[PDB]
Write a protein that holds these residues in place. Structure first.
Motif, PDB file in Angstrom:
ATOM      1  N   UNK A   4       5.186   5.715   5.274  1.00  0.00           N
ATOM      2  CA  UNK A   4       5.374   4.653   4.182  1.00  0.00           C
ATOM      3  C   UNK A   4       4.179   5.060   3.277  1.00  0.00           C
ATOM      4  N   UNK A   5       4.216   4.344   2.097  1.00  0.00           N
ATOM      5  CA  UNK A   5       3.170   4.183   0.886  1.00  0.00           C
ATOM      6  C   UNK A   5       3.259   3.056   0.232  1.00  0.00           C
ATOM      7  N   UNK A   6       1.608   2.728   0.142  1.00  0.00           N
ATOM      8  CA  UNK A   6       1.525   1.438  -0.373  1.00  0.00           C
ATOM      9  C   UNK A   6       0.389   1.390  -1.473  1.00  0.00           C
ATOM     10  N   UNK A   7       0.892   0.430  -2.528  1.00  0.00           N
ATOM     11  CA  UNK A   7      -0.229   0.690  -3.611  1.00  0.00           C
ATOM     12  C   UNK A   7      -0.967  -0.669  -3.722  1.00  0.00           C
ATOM     13  N   UNK A   8      -2.002  -0.761  -3.782  1.00  0.00           N
ATOM     14  CA  UNK A   8      -3.294  -1.817  -3.802  1.00  0.00           C
ATOM     15  C   UNK A   8      -4.354  -1.960  -4.839  1.00  0.00           C
ATOM     16  N   UNK A   9      -3.978  -2.531  -5.919  1.00  0.00           N
ATOM     17  CA  UNK A   9      -4.860  -2.988  -7.193  1.00  0.00           C
ATOM     18  C   UNK A   9      -6.248  -3.605  -6.444  1.00  0.00           C
ATOM     19  N   UNK A  10      -7.146  -3.527  -7.051  1.00  0.00           N
ATOM     20  CA  UNK A  10      -8.568  -4.135  -6.527  1.00  0.00           C
ATOM     21  C   UNK A  10      -8.301  -5.865  -6.684  1.00  0.00           C
ATOM     22  N   UNK A  43       9.320   3.926   1.353  1.00  0.00           N
ATOM     23  CA  UNK A  43       9.411   3.721   2.918  1.00  0.00           C
ATOM     24  C   UNK A  43      10.284   4.788   3.389  1.00  0.00           C
ATOM     25  N   UNK A  44      10.060   4.905   4.627  1.00  0.00           N
ATOM     26  CA  UNK A  44      10.751   6.067   5.368  1.00  0.00           C
ATOM     27  C   UNK A  44      10.474   7.489   4.581  1.00  0.00           C
ATOM     28  N   UNK A  45       9.421   7.527   4.087  1.00  0.00           N
ATOM     29  CA  UNK A  45       9.146   9.161   3.669  1.00  0.00           C
ATOM     30  C   UNK A  45       9.599   9.389   2.088  1.00  0.00           C
ATOM     31  N   UNK A  46      10.760   8.836   1.798  1.00  0.00           N
ATOM     32  CA  UNK A  46      11.090   9.197   0.346  1.00  0.00           C
ATOM     33  C   UNK A  46      12.113   7.993  -0.310  1.00  0.00           C
ATOM     34  N   UNK A  47      12.440   7.004   0.709  1.00  0.00           N
ATOM     35  CA  UNK A  47      13.292   6.053   0.101  1.00  0.00           C
ATOM     36  C   UNK A  47      12.535   4.985  -0.714  1.00  0.00           C
ATOM     37  N   UNK A  48      13.095   4.741  -2.048  1.00  0.00           N
ATOM     38  CA  UNK A  48      12.204   3.626  -2.774  1.00  0.00           C
ATOM     39  C   UNK A  48      12.978   2.415  -3.050  1.00  0.00           C
ATOM     40  N   UNK A  49      12.067   1.399  -2.739  1.00  0.00           N
ATOM     41  CA  UNK A  49      12.425   0.076  -2.754  1.00  0.00           C
ATOM     42  C   UNK A  49      13.074  -0.277  -4.178  1.00  0.00           C
ATOM     43  N   UNK A  50      13.974  -1.476  -4.432  1.00  0.00           N
ATOM     44  CA  UNK A  50      14.111  -2.136  -5.832  1.00  0.00           C
ATOM     45  C   UNK A  50      12.749  -2.549  -6.367  1.00  0.00           C
ATOM     46  N   UNK A  51      12.899  -2.206  -7.595  1.00  0.00           N
ATOM     47  CA  UNK A  51      11.563  -2.417  -8.678  1.00  0.00           C
ATOM     48  C   UNK A  51      10.585  -1.688  -8.753  1.00  0.00           C
ATOM     49  N   UNK A  52      10.782  -0.663  -7.896  1.00  0.00           N
ATOM     50  CA  UNK A  52       9.657   0.379  -7.954  1.00  0.00           C
ATOM     51  C   UNK A  52      10.133   1.281  -9.030  1.00  0.00           C
ATOM     52  N   UNK A  53       9.216   1.984  -9.860  1.00  0.00           N
ATOM     53  CA  UNK A  53       9.537   3.004 -10.784  1.00  0.00           C
ATOM     54  C   UNK A  53      10.003   4.294 -10.389  1.00  0.00           C
ATOM     55  N   UNK A  88       9.198   7.018 -11.066  1.00  0.00           N
ATOM     56  CA  UNK A  88       7.840   8.014 -11.359  1.00  0.00           C
ATOM     57  C   UNK A  88       7.445   8.121  -9.721  1.00  0.00           C
ATOM     58  N   UNK A  89       7.266   7.356  -8.951  1.00  0.00           N
ATOM     59  CA  UNK A  89       6.726   7.382  -7.542  1.00  0.00           C
ATOM     60  C   UNK A  89       7.908   7.968  -6.750  1.00  0.00           C
ATOM     61  N   UNK A  90       7.708   9.076  -6.322  1.00  0.00           N
ATOM     62  CA  UNK A  90       8.578   9.971  -5.317  1.00  0.00           C
ATOM     63  C   UNK A  90       7.834  10.362  -4.042  1.00  0.00           C
ATOM     64  N   UNK A  91       8.651  10.735  -3.023  1.00  0.00           N
ATOM     65  CA  UNK A  91       7.970  11.016  -1.513  1.00  0.00           C
ATOM     66  C   UNK A  91       8.719  12.203  -1.097  1.00  0.00           C
ATOM     67  N   UNK A  92       7.919  13.019  -0.682  1.00  0.00           N
ATOM     68  CA  UNK A  92       8.114  14.314   0.132  1.00  0.00           C
ATOM     69  C   UNK A  92       7.414  14.521   1.321  1.00  0.00           C
ATOM     70  N   UNK A  93       7.884  15.834   1.886  1.00  0.00           N
ATOM     71  CA  UNK A  93       6.970  15.914   3.276  1.00  0.00           C
ATOM     72  C   UNK A  93       7.047  17.638   3.533  1.00  0.00           C
ATOM     73  N   UNK A  94       6.058  18.102   3.900  1.00  0.00           N
ATOM     74  CA  UNK A  94       5.950  19.473   4.530  1.00  0.00           C
ATOM     75  C   UNK A  94       5.146  19.729   5.677  1.00  0.00           C
ATOM     76  N   UNK A  95       5.959  20.221   6.620  1.00  0.00           N
ATOM     77  CA  UNK A  95       5.163  20.430   7.813  1.00  0.00           C
ATOM     78  C   UNK A  95       4.642  19.062   8.490  1.00  0.00           C
ATOM     79  N   UNK A  96       3.127  19.104   8.334  1.00  0.00           N
ATOM     80  CA  UNK A  96       2.442  18.020   9.111  1.00  0.00           C
ATOM     81  C   UNK A  96       1.626  17.306   8.011  1.00  0.00           C
TER      82      UNK A  96
END
Lengths: 169, 210, 213
Positions: free
Chosen positions: B34-40, B49-59, B61-69
């Motif tokens: 999964x991926x998390x964004x943290x402003x200071x 979440x789960x590699x490429x799934x994008x929750x509601x309200x998230x733009x 522009x943010x996309x997820x992918x994977x290659x090998x390791x």
């Protein structure tokens, strides 16, 4: 020698059962000792229900008078890598737990040790050649931190500290 | 397990940038991280979440992918509000977060730092202590390395440097302190504060006799 | 709206214990596991454990086994995190998060700062940084804990002012500086005073910065 469990209130001798299985939780975090630790499940009745190896006995961390496997000890989980998912352990051979009636229910130390070994062995199949360690419950509400069960219109609470304190290579 | 992320990464407004997350364990193909964004000064927020799934309200522009390791987070339309820390997270075995990647959005040109070095105060000297104060301001982007020098000799002992913080004008600022013994300060010809930014350093020097 | 609100910041001595609470709202408290993740200042995120709001059951990371205790109060929809025998490297921001699955933590609490230090509350020593466009400032030295406030001429001089973030020395005390850029011609004319204020120790210092010949 036998393993005795402090129960409260004192269960009558006729409330003695056969342990036909149990439910565990794999501890999170990491260890530089190459060990995998298992404790009594930190889950709900939901975790217990989804095991589907129970009979007519309402119990928590140990399955009393439930389903037995026909070949070997079988372990199951919705996700082996998710430590938030409990692990359903169904025994192949039941283990007697006898209640004296004076506040203690005793289990054979030898038979339980052999049982844990069969469990740990099956656990090695899933998590690899590592050291399997059983520790007491992490804690929780009275029903779940203890081995609790219903018998004769009464609910008993038995501490299971002595049941989960073994190391297996 | 352990997840490896690049320490930082840069991008200009409008362009696409990709942050990588590589696992050193037994790598299965079978939606890992999964991926998390943290402003200071803010709590982390779930972007992917789960590699490429994008929750509601998230733009989008943010996309997820994977290659090998390697799993990757890709931001398409880079904006200034995207400037934050990005952590990858895996639950396998036990929840483990990546080292984190500090994304910087370059909405400003290259700027050299203003360095002001202060000698030990007269009143501090009577307090039987001595402190050199190097103040660094107005530099972009926000990455500086501070080096101290006693005459010709470098000094690392007694050095405390703050991390670069954003200024008013979206410039960055930092400060370095060299705690000195009152017998040590006057024992040397000069003390220097060297501030390396973007390949060039501004150096200021002070002397025990003004 | 789904929301997690945590308790206030705390300062602690080593060997002591700390208990943080996490208030849930906008959803049924028992419907989701609650996880705890801490973050050292300027570092990454570290998982600590989860708790089952229905059974009270927990699962701590082995790193904290024996030092953490996670509880809940379903009546007030609050999860608690207690860490005992604190040490300096336990200094971090502690988050609570709603599991919502495997590693799908959403939402997070605002976080709670737990500062573990053997240092006691101590007001700062203020030293003037004499001018030598000209730069003059005040050195706010050796104080604990955060924060301190600095103004110039009781707030009059507001432009060209830059108060820098504090640093943490090896002694466990904080130090800070505030420099202001003023016209070089107005050095032997205008009077410049920094107004340092350290409310934790109830300390106030007015120091005048004069140019040294």
């Amino acid at each position: 020698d036998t393993i005795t469990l402090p129960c409260r209130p004192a269960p009558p001798p006729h409330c003695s059962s056969n342990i036909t299985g149990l439910i565990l939780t794999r501890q999170g975090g990491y260890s530089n000792a190459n060990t995998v630790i298992f404790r009594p499940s930190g889950g709900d009745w939901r975790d217990i229900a989804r095991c589907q190896i129970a009979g007519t006995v309402v119990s928590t961390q140990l399955f009393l008078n439930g389903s037995l496997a026909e070949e070997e000890v079988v372990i199951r989980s919705e996700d082996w890598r998710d430590n938030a998912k409990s692990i359903c352990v169904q025994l192949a051979t039941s283990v007697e737990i006898a209640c004296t009636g004076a506040g203690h229910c005793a289990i054979s130390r030898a038979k339980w040790a052999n049982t844990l070994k069969q469990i740990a062995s099956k656990l090695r199949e899933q998590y690899g050649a590592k050291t399997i360690i059983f520790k007491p419950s992490s804690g929780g509400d009275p029903e779940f931190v203890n081995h609790s069960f219903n018998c004769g219109g009464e609910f008993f609470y038995c501490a299971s500290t002595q049941l989960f304190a073994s190391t297996w290579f | 397990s352990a997840l490896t992320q690049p320490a930082s990464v840069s991008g200009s407004p409008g362009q696409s940038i990709t942050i990588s997350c590589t696992g050193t364990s037994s790598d299965v193909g079978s939606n890992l991280v999964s991926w998390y964004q943290q402003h200071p000064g803010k709590a982390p927020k779930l972007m992917i979440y789960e590699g490429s799934k994008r929750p509601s309200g998230v733009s989008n522009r943010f996309s997820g992918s994977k290659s090998g390791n390697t799993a990757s987070l890709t931001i398409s339309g880079l904006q200034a509000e995207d400037e934050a820390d990005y952590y990858c997270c895996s639950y396998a075995g036990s929840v483990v977060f990546g080292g984190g990647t500090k994304l910087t959005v370059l909405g400003q040109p290259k700027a050299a730092p203003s360095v002001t070095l202060f000698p030990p105060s007269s009143e501090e000297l009577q307090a039987n202590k001595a402190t050199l104060v190097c103040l660094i301001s107005d530099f972009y982007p926000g990455a500086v390395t501070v080096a101290w020098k006693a005459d010709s000799s470098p000094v690392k002992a007694g050095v405390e440097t703050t991390t670069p913080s954003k200024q008013s004008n979206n410039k960055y600022a930092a400060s370095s302190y060299l705690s000195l013994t009152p017998e040590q300060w006057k024992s040397h010809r000069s003390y220097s504060c060297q501030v390396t930014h973007e390949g060039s350093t501004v150096e200021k020097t002070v002397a025990p006799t003004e | 709206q789904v929301q997690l609100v945590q308790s206030g910041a705390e300062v602690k001595k080593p060997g002591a214990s700390v208990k943080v609470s996490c208030k849930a709202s906008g959803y049924t408290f028992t419907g989701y596991y609650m996880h705890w993740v801490r973050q050292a200042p300027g570092q990454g995120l570290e998982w600590m454990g989860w708790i089952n709001p229905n059974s009270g059951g927990t699962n701590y990371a082995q790193k904290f086994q024996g030092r953490v205790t996670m509880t809940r109060d379903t009546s007030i929809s609050t999860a608690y995190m207690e860490l005992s025998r604190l040490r300096s490297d336990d200094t971090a921001v502690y988050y609570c998060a709603r599991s919502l699955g495997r590693d799908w933590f959403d939402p997070w609490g605002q976080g709670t700062l737990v500062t573990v230090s053997s240092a006691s509350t101590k007001g700062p020593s203020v030293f003037p940084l004499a001018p030598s466009t000209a730069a003059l400032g005040c050195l706010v030295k050796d104080y604990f804990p955060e924060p301190v406030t600095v103004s110039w001429n009781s707030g009059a001089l507001t432009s060209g002012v830059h108060t820098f973030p504090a640093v943490l020395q090896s002694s466990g005390l904080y130090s800070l500086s505030s420099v202001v850029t003023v016209p070089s011609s107005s050095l032997g004319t205008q009077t410049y005073i920094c107004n340092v204020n350290h409310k934790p120790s109830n300390t106030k210092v007015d120091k005048k910065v004069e140019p040294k010949s």
